[PDB]
Design a protein. Structure first.
Length: 104
């Protein structure tokens, strides 16, 4: 399982530009197609973003002591950010996202 937690901000056609909201990024799949589910602590129906053949870039930036900010840009220009992630968890997610981006 690949799931990370922290304040989330998204810029996309399906969400508009959201404010920072506590939640999680979780990896899901079906017949080799990989997607990402955004769940918020406040609830509501989670939104899903395709990852397979849809990742443009993944950037990690320091977010204080032992934490990182992960920034995922998709090929449709959707921008997903997750902040204050324990650095080891953020690096594992980045490694996985890089492998998906490289069709592995």
């Amino acid at each position: 399982s690949l799931k990370i937690h922290g304040p989330i901000r998204i810029r996309s056609m399906q969400t508009g530009i959201t404010k920072w909201k506590e939640g999680s990024f979780e990896i899901v799949e079906k017949e080799n197609k990989v997607s990402l589910v955004v769940h918020y602590n406040t609830g509501g129906i989670p939104r899903i973003f395709q990852l397979s053949h849809n990742i443009k870039n993944v950037v990690l930036r320091p977010s204080g002591a032992k934490q990182s900010r992960l920034m995922l840009t998709l090929q449709d220009n959707s921008f997903l950010s997750i902040d204050k992630v324990p650095s080891k968890d953020a690096e594992e997610m980045r490694l996985f996202l890089d492998a998906v981006h490289q069709n592995r």
